[PDB]
Amino acid sequence: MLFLFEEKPLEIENKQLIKRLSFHIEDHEHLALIGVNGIGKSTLLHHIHKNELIDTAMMEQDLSKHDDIDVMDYVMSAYIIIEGNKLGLSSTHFEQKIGTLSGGEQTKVSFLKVILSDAPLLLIDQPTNHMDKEMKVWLIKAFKSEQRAILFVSHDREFLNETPDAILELTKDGATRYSGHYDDYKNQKDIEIETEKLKYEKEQKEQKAIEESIKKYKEWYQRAAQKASVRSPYAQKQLSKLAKRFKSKEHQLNRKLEESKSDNPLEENKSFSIENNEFKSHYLVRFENVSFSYKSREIFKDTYFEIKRNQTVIIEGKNGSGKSTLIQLILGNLLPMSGAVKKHPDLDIGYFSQDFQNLNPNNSVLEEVMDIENMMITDARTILASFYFDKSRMNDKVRQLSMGEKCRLQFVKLYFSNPHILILDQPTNYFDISMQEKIIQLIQSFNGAVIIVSHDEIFKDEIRDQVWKIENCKLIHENVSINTPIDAESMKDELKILEQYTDERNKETD
Amino acid sequence: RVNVTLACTECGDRNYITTKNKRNNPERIEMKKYCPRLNKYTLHRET
Amino acid sequence: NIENGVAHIRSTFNNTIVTITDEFGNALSWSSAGALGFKGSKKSTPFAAQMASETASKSAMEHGLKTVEVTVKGPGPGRESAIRALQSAGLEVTAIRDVTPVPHNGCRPPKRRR
RNA sequence: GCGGGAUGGAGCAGUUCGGUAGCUCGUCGGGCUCAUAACCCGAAGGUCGGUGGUUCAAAUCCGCCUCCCGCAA
RNA sequence: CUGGAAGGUUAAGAGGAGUGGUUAGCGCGAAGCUACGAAUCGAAGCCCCAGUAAACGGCGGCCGUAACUAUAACGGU
RNA sequence: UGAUAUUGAAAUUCGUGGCUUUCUAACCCGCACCACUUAUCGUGGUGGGAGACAGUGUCAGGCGGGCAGUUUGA
Ligand SMILES: Nc1ncnc2c1ncn2[C@@H]1O[C@H](COP(=O)(O)OP(=O)(O)OP(=O)(O)O)[C@@H](O)[C@H]1O
Numbered sequence: 060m061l062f063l064f065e066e067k068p069l070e071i072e073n074k075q076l077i078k079r080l081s082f083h084i085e086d087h088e089h090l091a092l093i094g095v096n097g098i099g100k101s102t103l104l105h106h107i108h109k110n111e112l113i114d115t116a117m118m119e120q121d122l123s124k125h126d127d128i129d130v131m132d133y134v135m136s137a138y139i140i141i142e143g144n145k146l147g148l149s150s151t152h153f154e155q156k157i158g159t160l161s162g163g164e165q166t167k168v169s170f171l172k173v174i175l176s177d178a179p180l181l182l183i184d185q186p187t188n189h190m191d192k193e194m195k196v197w198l199i200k201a202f203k204s205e206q207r208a209i210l211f212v213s214h215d216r217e218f219l220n221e222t223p224d225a226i227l228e229l230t231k232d233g234a235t236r237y238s239g240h241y242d243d244y245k246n247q248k249d250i251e252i253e254t255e256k257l258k259y260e261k262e263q264k265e266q267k268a269i270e271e272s273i274k275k276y277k278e279w280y281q282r283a284a285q286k287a288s289v290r291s292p293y294a295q296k297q298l299s300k301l302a303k304r305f306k307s308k309e310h311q312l313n314r315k316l317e318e319s320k321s322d323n324p325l326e327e328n329k330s331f332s333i334e335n336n337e338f339k340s341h342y343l344v345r346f347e348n349v350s351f352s353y354k355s356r357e358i359f360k361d362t363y364f365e366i367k368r369n370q371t372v373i374i375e376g377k378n379g380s381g382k383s384t385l386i387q388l389i390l391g392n393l394l395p396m397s398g399a400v401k402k403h404p405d406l407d408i409g410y411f412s413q414d415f416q417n418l419n420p421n422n423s424v425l426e427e428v429m430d431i432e433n434m435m436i437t438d439a440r441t442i443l444a445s446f447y448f449d450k451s452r453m454n455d456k457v458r459q460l461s462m463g464e465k466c467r468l469q470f471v472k473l474y475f476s477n478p479h480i481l482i483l484d485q486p487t488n489y490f491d492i493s494m495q496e497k498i499i500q501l502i503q504s505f506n507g508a509v510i511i512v513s514h515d516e517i518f519k520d521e522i523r524d525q526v527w528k529i530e531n532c533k534l535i536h537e538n539v540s541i542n543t544p545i546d547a548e549s550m551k552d553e554l555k556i557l558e559q560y561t562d563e564r565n566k567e568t569d
Numbered sequence: 570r571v572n573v574t575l576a577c578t579e580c581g582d583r584n585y586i587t588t589k590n591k592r593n594n595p596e597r598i599e600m601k602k603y604c605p606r607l608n609k610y611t612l613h614r615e616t
Numbered sequence: 617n618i619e620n621g622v623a624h625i626r627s628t629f630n631n632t633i634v635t636i637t638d639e640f641g642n643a644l645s646w647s648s649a650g651a652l653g654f655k656g657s658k659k660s661t662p663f664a665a666q667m668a669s670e671t672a673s674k675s676a677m678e679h680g681l682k683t684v685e686v687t688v689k690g691p692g693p694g695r696e697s698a699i700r701a702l703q704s705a706g707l708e709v710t711a712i713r714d715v716t717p718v719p720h721n722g723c724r725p726p727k728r729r730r
Numbered sequence: 731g732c733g734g735g736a737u738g739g740a741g742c743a744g745u746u747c748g749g750u751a752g753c754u755c756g757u758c759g760g761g762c763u764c765a766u767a768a769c770c771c772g773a774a775g776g777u778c779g780g781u782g783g784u785u786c787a788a789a790u791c792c793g794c795c796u797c798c799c800g801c802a803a
Numbered sequence: 804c805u806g807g808a809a810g811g812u813u814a815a816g817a818g819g820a821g822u823g824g825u826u827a828g829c830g831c832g833a834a835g836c837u838a839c840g841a842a843u844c845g846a847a848g849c850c851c852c853a854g855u856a857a858a859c860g861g862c863g864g865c866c867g868u869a870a871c872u873a874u875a876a877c878g879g880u
Numbered sequence: 881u882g883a884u885a886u887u888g889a890a891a892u893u894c895g896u897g898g899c900u901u902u903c904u905a906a907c908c909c910g911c912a913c914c915a916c917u918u919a920u921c922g923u924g925g926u927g928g929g930a931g932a933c934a935g936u937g938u939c940a941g942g943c944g945g946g947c948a949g950u951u952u953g954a
Pocket residue numbers: 071072073074094095096097098099100101102103459460461462463464489490491
């Protein structure tokens with residue numbers, strides 16, 4: 060028993076999020092904490108760090124407040140120095156700022172500071188945030204190495220299938236502990252959803268049959284009440300006896316309703332859409348021996364790049380290759396070389412950024428979407444709902460929203476920006492398990508061109524049309540069949556199999 | 570629209586009981602009122 | 617470990633199957649056209665019976681069997697290519713047999729298709 | 731008089747707690763055929779019965795009205 | 804009603820990290836005695852799955868269509 | 881339907897505790913033979929069968945119009 064959370068209401072700030080929240084965390088146990096976006100998985104982690112007992116680690120998931128602190132003294136925020144030989148992370152260097160790193164190079168300078176902290180319980184956020192397919196196959200081997208207790212937030216159902224020992228599912232009812240991996244949690248959450256709809260389908264069919272018996276007694280009654288003499292005590296008495304028939308099956312109906320009440324409420328299969336402008340030309344953007352450099356780092360030497368009308372491009376590489384800086388050259392970065400990034404003079408662009416430099420902090424939700432040119436208030440508030448902004452989140456500063464929200468807020472600005480191309484940079488990274496499908500259909504039901512930068516394999520596996528790549532300092536293509544030829548010696552090998560005919564088999568008994 | 574308790578900030582705790590709308594005042598309310606243990610006007614935070 | 621098994625080729629008009637045993641019918645390893653993920657009308661053909669007959673042997677090659685004496689069963693388009701897949705992958709056939717079931721007039725057979 | 735209705739031409743979801751007008755069939759114009767049906771391609775057609783109210787926002791909620799339906803006048 | 808390898812949820816009992824009381828000592832708190840008390844373990848049943856009507860029980864609407872009219876063998880939903 | 885008492889023995893097994901086996905001395909037989917004995921009761925002896933189960937006490941959970949006591953406005 061490493062830690063008990065005695066039943067108390069959870070709340071980050073003035074607002075209250077949950078009441079009656081309790082759970083325990085053993086020793087030497089890695090415990091996943093999954094839940095919907097905006098429910099409080101990160102506020103609960105702040106609580107145990109600040110207001111709770113035993114010292115902890117608290118690897119955050121934004122690092123935005125501290126963006127000018129020199130790295131190598133952010134790592135030493137707690138305190139000859141065992142860091143050079145701790146480059147298993149492959150962290151670049153410790154002389155930059157910390158708001159100047161890659162998006163996924165600072166999710167392993169905060170994982171470095173968390174492992175070297177020497178505390179009993181490690182409070183970790185997302186940690187597969189922004190990471191590659193190789194740096195994400197490395198810490199799967201790292202979490203299975205330390206005898207400390209971890210309590211992390213993942214919502215990544217490939218990482219969640221090997222690491223955890225139990226799962227803690229926040230609901231706004233409290234935490235419901237499960238055992239096993241994500242697939243053991245998922246099986247039991249399915250059996251639990253059948254019973255509520257079989258139980259709901261069985262109360263509707265029990266209460267409609269009592270309404271129809273009741274309604275039949277009343278057709279008999281008003282037909283009999285006009286035929287009965289008011290001066291007959293026998294015919295009246297049969298009339299009051301018939302009323303008892305329906306008056307007592309109205310009391311059976313009223314004890315089913317005021318006693319048997321549930322709903323199947325999470326049933327709305329709506330979906331989003333965006334409409335392009337039908338470019339009508341061949342090339343969208345182009346590079347002409349472009350080069351770039353970050354004061355010592357030579358990112359791109361002279362390279363070529365092209366995107367034509369109605370294409371889908373998938374850029375690849377690793378952490379630090381230059382994906383999010385190539386997307387910057389397309390809008391504006393003013394190359395140091397000549398380069399001359401050749402762009403069409405009539406382009407609309409829909410930008411989804413890794414860091415939320417699109418969104419204006421210190422700006423309410425309602426008054427940020429309304430910053431566009433000729434947006435009205437009805438069509439703005441009405442599209443703001445259907446993205447799950449429940450008409451009361453209108454007066455919230457963007458600076459104090461969730462991470463899942465405000466990744467959903469720059470999708471509600473894409474709808475009002477009818478583009479020619481969508482430039483999406485890690486679009487399914489901060490989204491929970493249920494919202495990663497509602498925006499994979501959106502990207503596929505867009506009839507324009509898109510440039511996708513993404514690290515999850517099961518999203519960029521069925522949409523692979525064109526795949527560039529950054530190997531040394533230059534982009535490559537998928538029309539480079541220099542890697543693996545098919546080695547056409549089949550000419551020598553599909554000549555033995557040519558002679559087993561369909562009639563040669565008919566003969567030649569064995 | 571809730572019920573709120575105004576507790577003294579130095580003389581220690583509850584003196585007054587009021588109401589508030591938590592959509593218009595989501596924070597904790599602040600008002601100077603008479604603490605009768607200090608015999609003096611002080612500041613009262615909502616509990 | 618083991619030496620001298622027998623290969624049990626089993627080809628039908630959909631799907632061949634090769635299973636290698638010891639000489640006591642002990643099932644060293646099996647494999648077959650549809651396991652490699654061949655869909656119908658490819659599942660059936662002589663190429664796939666020579667994949668399948670060598671994803672087997674090479675995965676019981678590895679028990680040091682090297683001499684097999686095959687027994688064959690079925691009609692099959694892809695029977696015989698599965699015995700140049702075998703003897704290809706280093707196994708040294710001994711001598712073969714066509715053990716197919718033949719009633720000495722037993723039970724009655726299904727209708728025939730129109 | 732009481733019950734249930736009205737959502738492109740037909741038949742129907744969606745209303746039950748307001749937030750991007752939907753499904754099958756048919757209609758129209760091309761193709762295929764010696765010709766027709768079937769099949770393939772492309773489009774049209776929506777006051778959510780009428781008329782007012784509530785709301786940042788109404789097919790959804792609130793009154794009034796004319797139709798259709800079933801019992802019973 | 805019958806039959807289900809497992810998985811979930813559940814009793815008594817087992818277990819005893821912790822929180823209170825008192826006070827030899829020096830507002831802190833050793834033993835002892837005391838008021839309690841969590842994690843884990845723990846069966847039927849129930850959830851869930853298949854079968855059974857000479858078991859209990861149940862056995863539909865609207866629309867268009869034929870060389871008189873009317874009906875509709877035929878069609879849509 | 882569980883825990884626990886009556887209630888024991890040896891081993892294998894995986895974690896001093898449990899699981900499962902096997903053994904028999906306890907307990908059980910409306911079971912054969914022999915005495916009491918004129919006896920289809922009972923008690924005692926002897927073989928067999930089963931056996932730490934079952935039956936029995938205490939505590940616990942499910943089911944429970946089979947059966948009770950009642951309520952079912954002005
Ligand atoms: N300073 C603040 N004042 C008031 N409310 C706040 C403040 N900061 C955050 N919140 C609120 O607290 C909630 C916390 O959501 P939280 O960020 O914990 O969700 P999450 O589990 O991180 O989801 P995701 O990881 O998908 O973003 C948000 O709804 C947000 O509105």
